[PDB]
Amino acid sequence: SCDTVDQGYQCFSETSHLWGQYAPFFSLANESVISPEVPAGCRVTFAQVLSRHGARYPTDSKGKKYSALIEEIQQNATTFDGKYAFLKTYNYSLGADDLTPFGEQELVNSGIKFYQRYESLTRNIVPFIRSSGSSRVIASGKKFIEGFQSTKLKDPRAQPGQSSPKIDVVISEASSSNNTLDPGTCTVFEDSELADTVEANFTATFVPSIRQRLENDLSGVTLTDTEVTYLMDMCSFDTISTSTVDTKLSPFCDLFTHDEWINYDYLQSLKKYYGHGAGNPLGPTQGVGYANELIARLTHSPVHDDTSSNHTLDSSPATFPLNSTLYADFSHDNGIISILFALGLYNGTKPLSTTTVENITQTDGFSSAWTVPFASRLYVEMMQCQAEQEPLVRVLVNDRVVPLHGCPVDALGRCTRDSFVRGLSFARSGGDWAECFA
Ligand SMILES: *[C@@H]1O[C@H](CO)[C@@H](O)[C@H](O)[C@H]1NC(C)=O
Ligand SMILES: *[C@@H]1O[C@H](CO)[C@@H](O)[C@H](O)[C@H]1NC(C)=O
Ligand SMILES: *[C@@H]1O[C@H](CO)[C@@H](O)[C@H](O)[C@H]1NC(C)=O
C-alpha cells in the first residue's frame, strides 16, 4: 500500500530511493514541475515506451562474493550485537540473475499503467514490441504484456478479439549483433576504463570512514572498501528479494547512515554518467542507433543509421513497421542511459563532480535512480493540439516531464516534431560511431 501500480515503490523512501539503479521503480510524477497530463485541446497520436527489466537477483559473480563475504564476516568477528546481531546467523539464500517475484510484478504494473495512460489508443491498437535478448529482459517484456492484456480485457471500450500483443522481435546480444537497445559492437567503448577510475577515486572519499567504523564494531574482521560497497549492495537485495518487500527494510540498511546512503546513490549516478552517459566520450554514441529508429518512427520514414542498427531487421515492415502507433522496447540500464543522452534529454546537466556529492538540482534532474531504476520507463509521445498544425513531441522519464533540448521548447516541455528531429543532428550524423575503431 506504499507500493502501488501508479506511484511505484514508495515504502522506506528515504533509504530505498538512494540505491541508484538498484532502486525499485518509484514514480517522479510529484516531482514534475510540468504537468504530465495531456493539455486541453490536445490529443496523443503516438506512444513509444522504452523499459528496463524488473528487479533481479544478484548476478552469479556478485552473489558468490556476497555469500563469501558474509561467511568471512561470520568466521572472524567476536561481537555481533546492537544493529549487528542479525549478521551472526544470516543465511544467504538469494537467487541468481533471474527476475524476482517483486521484479515480475513491477513489469505487470508497468503494463497496466501503460495500458491506461494511453487507453484511448491501447483499446484497439496492438503495439509493436521489441526486446533485447536476455532472459530477464524477455521475461520482463512478457510480464508487461501480461498486465497490458489483463487491463485490456477489463476495459469496456476495447475492440476484443484482436491478436495478442507479443514480443515481435528478440534482438540478439551476441558480440557480433547490431543491437540498438544495448549495442555491443563499439570496440573502443567496450574497452573503456573511465568508469572504474571514477568509481575508485570517488569511493576513496567516503567508504574509508565506514570501513573503519565497521571494523571497529565487528572485532576480528578486516574489510576492503569494495567489500563495504557489497554490504551496501545487500541492503537493496535483501529488501526487495523477499516476502517482506513491502513490510520491512533490510537489516543491512541500518548499518549505514542517511548521509552514507547519499554518497552511495551519487556513486551510482557516477558509474552510469561516466560509464554510458555524457561523461564518457563514446557513451551517448551508444544511443545513436535507437535515436535514429525513434526518428524513423516519428517521421514514418526509413531508418537512417550506420551505427548500431541491424539493416535486415530495420529495412523490413515486418520487423520494423513505421506506422504502428504504439511501440514498446525492453532493455538494460546501460543502454537506456546511452539512449537518454543521445536524445539530448540531459543537455542542461553539467558533468558530475568526481569528488563531491551533487543533489538532484545541481544535476538538473539526472541520477541513476531518477532514470534507470529497476523497471524504469521512458515514454515518448507525439500529440496533436488545437492551436497548431504540427505534431508536438513530449518525453517523460519515470513519470517526470523532461523538457526537450536542441529545439524551441515551449513551457509544457514540448517541441514541434520537425524541430525535435532537426535537433538530433548528433544522432543523425552517426554521432562518434567512426571512433569505435580508430
Ligand atoms: C540481423 O538480424 C538477423 C535476423 O534476426 C540476424 O540473423 C543477423 O545476425 C543480424 N545481423 C547482425 C549484424 O546483428
Ligand atoms: C578473515 O580472516 C582471514 C584469515 O585470517 C583473512 O584473510 C580474511 O581477509 C578475513 N576476512 C574478513 C572479511 O574479516
Ligand atoms: C546535446 O549536447 C551534446 C553535448 O555534446 C551535443 O553533442 C548534442 O548535439 C546535443 N544534443 C541536442 C539534442 O541538443
- Selection from 187, 182, 210, 224 nearest residue 68 by Cα: 224
Q: Is 271 a domain residue?
A: yes
For CA atoms 73, 77, 82, 85, the dihedral sign is: positive
Among the listed residues 17, 53, 258, 311, the single catalytic one is 53
Q: Is the CB of 99 under 6 A from ligand 3?
A: no
CA of 50 to the centre of ligand 2 (A): 44
Nearest ligand atom owner, CA of 219: 2
Nearest ligand atom owner, CA of 404: 3
Which DSSP string do the residues of 237-283 spell out, in sequence order? HHHHTSGGGGT---GGGGGS-HHHHHHHHHHHHHHHHHHTSTTSTTT
| Ligand 3: nearest atom to the Cα of 404 | 13
The H-or-E segment that residue 393 falls in is strand 392-397
Q: Is 39 a domain residue?
A: no
- Residue identifier of the C-alpha nearest atom 9 of ligand 3: 426
CA of 78 to the centre of ligand 2 (A): 13
Q: Is the CB of 352 under 6 A from ligand 3?
A: no
Note the Cα 111 to chain centre separation in Å. Answer: 16
Do residues 308 and 288 make contact, with C-beta atoms less than 8 angstroms apart? yes
Q: Is 78 a domain residue?
A: yes
Note the Cα 109 to chain centre separation in Å. Answer: 16
CA distance 419 to 409: 10
Q: Is 61 a domain residue?
A: yes
CA distance 414 to 35: 12
Site to probe by mutation for ligand 2, drawn from 222, 224, 230, 231 as the one with most ligand atoms within 8 Å of Cβ, is 222
| Ligand 3: nearest atom to the Cα of 342 | 11
CATH number at residue 184: 3.40.50.1240
What is the structure's resolution, reported in angstroms to one decimal? Answer: 2.4
Domain holding 193, by residue range, is 46-436
Do residues 26 and 307 make contact, with C-beta atoms less than 8 angstroms apart? no
CA distance 241 to 254: 17
Is 53 catalytic? The answer is yes
Q: Is 31 a domain residue?
A: no
Cβ-proximal residues to 126 (8 Å cutoff; 6+ apart), any chain: 162, 163, 164, 165, 324, 326
CA of 67 to the centre of ligand 2 (A): 14
Q: Is the CB of 405 under 6 A from ligand 3?
A: yes
Q: How far is residue 30 from each of residues 26, 233, 269, 285, measured CA to CA in Å? A: 11, 27, 21, 32
| Residue 300 burial (10 A CB sphere; 0-12, 13-18, 19+) | exposed
Site to probe by mutation for ligand 2, drawn from 76, 219, 231 as the one with most ligand atoms within 8 Å of Cβ, is 76
- Residue identifier of the C-alpha nearest atom 4 of ligand 2: 76
**Residue ranges of E strands in 94-204:** 128-132, 169-171
CA distance 403 to 291: 17
The count of domains in the chain is 1
Phi then psi for 215, rounded to 5 degrees?
A: -75, -30
Which DSSP string do the residues of 58-114 spell out, in sequence order? PPHHHHHHHHHHHHHHHHH-S---GGGGGGTT-------SSBPHHHHHHHHHHHHHH
Q: Is 328 a domain residue?
A: yes
Reduce the DSSP state of residue 382 to 3 states and report it.
Answer: strand
Torsion of CA 341, 166, 135, 187, to 10 degrees: -40
Q: Is 337 a domain residue?
A: yes
CA of 7 to the centre of ligand 1 (A): 38
Cell of 72: 568471512
CA distance 118 to 326: 9
Q: Is 4 a domain residue?
A: no
